[PDB]
Amino acid sequence: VELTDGFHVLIDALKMNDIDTMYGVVGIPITNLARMWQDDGQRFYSFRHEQHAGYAASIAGYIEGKPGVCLTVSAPGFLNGVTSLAHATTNCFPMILLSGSSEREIVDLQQGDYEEMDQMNVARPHCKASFRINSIKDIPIGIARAVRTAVSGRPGGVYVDLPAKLFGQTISVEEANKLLFKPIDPAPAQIPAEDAIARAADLIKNAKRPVIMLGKGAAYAQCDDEIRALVEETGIPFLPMGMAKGLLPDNHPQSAAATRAFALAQCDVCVLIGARLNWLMQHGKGKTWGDELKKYVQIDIQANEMDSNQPIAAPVVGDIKSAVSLLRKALKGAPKADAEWTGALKAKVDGNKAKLAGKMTAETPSGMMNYSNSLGVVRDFMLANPDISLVNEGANALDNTRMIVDMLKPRKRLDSGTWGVMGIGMGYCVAAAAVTGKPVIAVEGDSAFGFSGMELETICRYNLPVTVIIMNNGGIYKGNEADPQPGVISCTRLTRGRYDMMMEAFGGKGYVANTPAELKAALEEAVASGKPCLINAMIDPDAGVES
Amino acid sequence: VELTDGFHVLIDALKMNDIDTMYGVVGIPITNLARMWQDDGQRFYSFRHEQHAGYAASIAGYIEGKPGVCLTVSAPGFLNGVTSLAHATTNCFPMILLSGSSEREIVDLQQGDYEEMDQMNVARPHCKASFRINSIKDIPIGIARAVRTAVSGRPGGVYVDLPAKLFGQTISVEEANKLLFKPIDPAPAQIPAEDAIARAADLIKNAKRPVIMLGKGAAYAQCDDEIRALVEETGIPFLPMGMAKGLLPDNHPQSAAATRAFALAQCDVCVLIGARLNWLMQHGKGKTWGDELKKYVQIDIQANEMDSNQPIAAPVVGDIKSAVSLLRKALKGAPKADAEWTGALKAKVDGNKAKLAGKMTAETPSGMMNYSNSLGVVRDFMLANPDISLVNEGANALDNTRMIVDMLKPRKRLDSGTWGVMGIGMGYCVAAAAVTGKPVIAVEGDSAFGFSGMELETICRYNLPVTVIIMNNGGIYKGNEADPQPGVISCTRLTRGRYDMMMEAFGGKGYVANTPAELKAALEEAVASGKPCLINAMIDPDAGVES
Amino acid sequence: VELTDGFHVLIDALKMNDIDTMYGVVGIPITNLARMWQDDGQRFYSFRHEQHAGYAASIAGYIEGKPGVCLTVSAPGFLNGVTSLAHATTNCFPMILLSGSSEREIVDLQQGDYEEMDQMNVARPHCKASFRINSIKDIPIGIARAVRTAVSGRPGGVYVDLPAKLFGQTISVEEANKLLFKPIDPAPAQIPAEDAIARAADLIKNAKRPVIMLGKGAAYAQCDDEIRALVEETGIPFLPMGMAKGLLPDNHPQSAAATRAFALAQCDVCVLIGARLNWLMQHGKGKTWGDELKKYVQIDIQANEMDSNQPIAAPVVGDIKSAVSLLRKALKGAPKADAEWTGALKAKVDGNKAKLAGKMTAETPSGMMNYSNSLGVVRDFMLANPDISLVNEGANALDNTRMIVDMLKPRKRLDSGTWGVMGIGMGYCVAAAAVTGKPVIAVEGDSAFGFSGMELETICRYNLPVTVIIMNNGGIYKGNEADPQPGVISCTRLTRGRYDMMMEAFGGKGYVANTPAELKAALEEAVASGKPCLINAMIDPDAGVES
Numbered sequence A, B, C: 001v002e003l004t005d006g007f008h009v010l011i012d013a014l015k016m017n018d019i020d021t022m023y024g025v026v027g028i029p030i031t032n033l034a035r036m037w038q039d040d041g042q043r044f045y046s047f048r049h050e051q052h053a054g055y056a057a058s059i060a061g062y063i064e065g066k067p068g069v070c071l072t073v074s075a076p077g078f079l080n081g082v083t084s085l086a087h088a089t090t091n092c093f094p095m096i097l098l099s100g101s102s103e104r105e106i107v108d109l110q111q112g113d114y115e116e117m118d119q120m121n122v123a124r125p126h127c128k129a130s131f132r133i134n135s136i137k138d139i140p141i142g143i144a145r146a147v148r149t150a151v152s153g154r155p156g157g158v159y160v161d162l163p164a165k166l167f168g169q170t171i172s173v174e175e176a177n178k179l180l181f182k183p184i185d186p187a188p189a190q191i192p193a194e195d196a197i198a199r200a201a202d203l204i205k206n207a208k209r210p211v212i213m214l215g216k217g218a219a220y221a222q223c224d225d226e227i228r229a230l231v232e233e234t235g236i237p238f239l240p241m242g243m244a245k246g247l248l249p250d251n252h253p254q255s256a257a258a259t260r261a262f263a264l265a266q267c268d269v270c271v272l273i274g275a276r277l278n279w280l281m282q283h284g285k286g287k288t289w290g291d292e293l294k295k296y297v298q299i300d301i302q303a304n305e306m307d308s309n310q311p312i313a314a315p316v317v318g319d320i321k322s323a324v325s326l327l328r329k330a331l332k333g334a335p336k337a338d339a340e341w342t343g344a345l346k347a348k349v350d351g352n353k354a355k356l357a358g359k360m361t362a363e364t365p366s367g368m369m370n371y372s373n374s375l376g377v378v379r380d381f382m383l384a385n386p387d388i389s390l391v392n393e394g395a396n397a398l399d400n401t402r403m404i405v406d407m408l409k410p411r412k413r414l415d416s417g418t419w420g421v422m423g424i425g426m427g428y429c430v431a432a433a434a435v436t437g438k439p440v441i442a443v444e445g446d447s448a449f450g451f452s453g454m455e456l457e458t459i460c461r462y463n464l465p466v467t468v469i470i471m472n473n474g475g476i477y478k479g480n481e482a483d484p485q486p487g488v489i490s491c492t493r494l495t496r497g498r499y500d501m502m503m504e505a506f507g508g509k510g511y512v513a514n515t516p517a518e519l520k521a522a523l524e525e526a527v528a529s530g531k532p533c534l535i536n537a538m539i540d541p542d543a544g545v546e547s
Ligand SMILES: Nc1ncnc2c1ncn2[C@@H]1O[C@H](COP(=O)(O)OP(=O)(O)O)[C@@H](O)[C@H]1O
Pocket: A090, A091, A092, A154, A155, A214, A215, A216, A217, A218, A220, A221, A241, A242, A243, A244, A274, A275, A276, A278, A280, A299, A300, A301, A302, A305, A318, A319, A320, A321, A418
């Protein structure tokens, strides 16, 4: 009677759930899992820190709509990875953190085992569900639970604890076959009732100055044609959130993005589609919303997200595709949004875009570029070459890139997210490049970048087509804050370093861009090469604002 | 009537408790605390990731015996820091993590605040106590509690939550000066009963083959002369744990370190001074202890550490200085350890040191050094220059450096610790340099180094006298593992990179060392320069072992 | 080769740690543990709800100074018991909650096992340490850890999770003998340094108007002669906290209890001995302390209790016996406290006691007694018969009994404690009677009593010499609050019921007392009988105050 072991049953269970990639860092007790994963023909990305392996898993989950999988070791390794897990859960990104753990007997009596921690219990606040698979016969069920919990309802992070003793357990191949199974429909459709849709339809029809807010929940739903048909048929102005950019092209004629404050402040009805009324929307109150209570339509899969901040007139609970599909039929043949309202917002968009175009064309000293004329180059490149992932984080480097770099394609812009995390950059680059098989451009603030900068070597080792643009202004916000005391450097200062040399240290290609023309020629060559590159864009230290 | 604010009451409260240094990363809502700390004339070290600012804080606590203070932002920055607090708590290092947090009203209803998290609750498993100062009037009491919890009993990490709204509250200077106070005797002496000492004296006096195990709790106590006087007066051979190296000079004639296996297996009485019978001691059982229950004497400030793993025949609960002083007087004038026991171990030690000296002088090809002849250079240098901090982490780079590099001075060796953390290196380097005012050498595994390597820029930015030695063997354990499939790199491989170039990129000095002679010249020149350096030591990819 | 099993190894380990009593409620999976405990000759008290079995365990711990042991079942049973555990931890009472739990495999995958819960993790905030014993070979060590954690440092609650699969495991009797052991010195003495004692001695010597506050930490320490010698030699007025009553007799001439507010408000030095500066001491501020900062001496075993509320001038950290013993020698031959100060407080005590004596002698209608003339009877009885435990809880029934019923003997008064728990009554009665083997009187508020009233049957079933006096005023605070609406009873009303009938329902003796003479004759007969009794004392519904 032939046997298989815990390593292989786990490998098999994972593949049966359509996982072919893991991002992690090896060591006791999980190194042979990673090796056997690779021997079997599946792929494993080894990082330099588990946090970044974890941010990679998280964004692979957003892009693909199946859980990104992170593999770590016990205690300190697990902790690093659980920080990324927390991030996924907050952003609604499906992810599974697999971590090796130590001996139950010793850990439960707190005796001081190798890398001792109840990792299952410390994971709890940072994930939807935290499980432990103790027995080889329970791996198929455990992985099914983890995948279902990650992708169903509101997607998010799940932790699966893999005690060291799990892997060496044996069981007959005949029994293993009998236990291995594929979950039916792990991310089911959830459809709203007629009267929920009808209440929303009547709000929108009687709106005088409506608006549609698209969030990354809408972008994640992968129903781009449905969402676009709703916008185009209703005639309603729309606004995308940071990662909702590209769902409809950012230069779509119904986009009120360039006149956002005016549109939010002046609307009567606001349709939230896969967008929370959280801090990124000023909680639906204050000066951004005209100091009044709007009448909201909200489409979300989480029922208790409704009324979380402001009362919602028309709550529609269900998956966005189902809900939008039904709303479109309820609104069929109704009048389009008021020409006076839509034309007024278009006039503000054109006037604001002309104002921005002047900034981008302006001239600056060599090596002292500003955020406008530097990011104008990236904008032009991205309009001509839209099938490229855009990774973005920082302060001035984020806000200006979101404003300037138009996305024409959905789920391409990958940014700091709901928590404004600095640290997501290089991990996002590795994952985006692994799952798309297409180029990646990153626009990194120099402070932002240093949270994950050592992963430059990971990008080189896997020869990925990623181009990292460092907005090297020499600091957090600004690069010129005076010494507080004689001989003491200010806390916001960073070395205006040769990040291009760092990239070349690990086999990558380095550029220094002192002018827009130099940034353009470097970017065009980098992306064309298909090789790991870094462009050190030299930005005026005083160009940024703090706020 | 004149007023002060939360910022300054916190600065004054910290200063009153003898804090003059913080390690952190700035941003909302805590940047202006960092600035005013510097304005007032105290020092702030800005890092590239909060985890490494936290590892610095942790080892500053070990070295000085007063809490290392780390300052982070809310949610994601807090999470990064709290991973280091965990480490502090596990290693018994006094540390305070100060983090800004968001708005109470919004976080408590989970509405989606900027960087939303119950950071106070999330910290609880990773610290001794988790507090929050909500009001200006409680800052001095709050900081007093933090410093007492951190340094008293078993020392460890404390989290203090600093809601954004705390800093802008105002109070009169006269009221604030009445509230501000310095705690009396925050880490008190705790003296054991006479019969506790008598029970231990009895076991030692009747031992045939006694051994003293010194742990890093003994080193932390800073009573090096007392511990040395106990060892010399009794004539008992001793064994240092990883960071107890140098407490007594590693070349002391009574050291049994080079014959640890034999000494532990054959002893009858084992005297634990500030050392746990945890995984680093194989839990007081198995082959390493000759498959028998030794008679244990244990000195520890934590009462319930006794009988955690094995029954302790002579528990002595109290601070190590107090206990050792009493034990010495209790053993005064008694005969020394058996000369055939201490002679047997000395013969083993000399024979084992002879075998290692043979390896350290062996010859290897250019760019293909092994761990003996490369680290033999570091050994010779540290014998000549002992007033230098030795930071160390990795697998082969750790085990071989702990074995080969003799520490003649206490609290100089700073390594991975109880959790075997990869990531402590560059943070430890910064704190060590800061608190000692003297040179630091780091012997880093190349995998190890990648967990904090971006902090090279921090080391350069503060112009610290730190020399980083990368044991560049091309991977985890080894750098030569075959491609598991055509064109697919193995998971344990790293780029054999130019880490020297990376250092040069931020204004440091980079060296490549292909031979022991090149490593020696470069190490001597680097330490003597007083400047940030990195030596890329080229190790044979097949040199290291795995299991 | 002869075998033993998990049940017996646990029984043996428990007895070796000097436990002979358990309080609990049986059922799956722990009923045979309770039976075998009894078969072996040890005693088991079965309650009607685990909470009250738990309050019994907690107070057995206070009285004896070794952990009270509660035995419960999984999920809902455990939860009930953990509520008592939390109470023990808050009051610093040594206690161990043993709970059966379900199958690891099923619970860790949250599949819906019988009584599913991670009881080890939900215990965490309510105890000092929460452990789980998975393996038969680890029971001796697990029980040692639990006992050491309960009684060492600051005493408190420990949870030990006993998975169902533990009990049926086998091991050789030869190996069981080898693993069973008795912890050496689980509650060690901890002695303070000379200079800590000397700083306190100098504060007390230079005090103009000193005072000693004795708390239940001092009463728990069982060093009654030491504490009394300190008071009598220094000549310092003293004040006892609720359960510190009787440590010195309440009518001791140096007691300033009857003039408490004046003494706290007018002192310059305050010596806290085993007493926290918490809500029961108004946090050392406000009108009770003259709106000024006192200079404090505090003796406590928990080092970080110091400066928790107010700055402490003379912190003495150590066990009370050790600390008081040393302080007494430092103060030897020094002048006694000022006659003008001690005589002034005595004059207020006498005048206040005369004022109280008039209230107690006053006449009331039959069936409408007040708190003074009713509790005056209990007072007289307790002076004549002091070797009786006094259990007490309620609002008016607590405050008036603490004021009126003088305790002449230590650790006899057992009350609501730090949390002001209603619910501790009948459990306290069962435990007090089990551990003392002497009579118990309970003074219960009628609302208070109903939290544990069904345990009257437990008291009868074990034929315990307990007399429950219900202060039957017909409500919470007052028994006469008008109906808020027509036909609706007010929320503070209770049925003025025949609690004497309820007692007789289970074989006990019932009395109704309508007058002081009737209460006196019933109490004298009840206590003389040595049988379970209840006196239904009919109190005027309008006699109480709410505040
Ligand atoms: N397929 C889906 N159907 C419905 N709602 C979804 C779906 N996927 C995600 N969501 C919801 O979308 C929301 C995403 O909001 P958020 O992350 O704040 O986006 P943004 O920051 O772009 O506004 C979440 O509330 C989540 O529950």
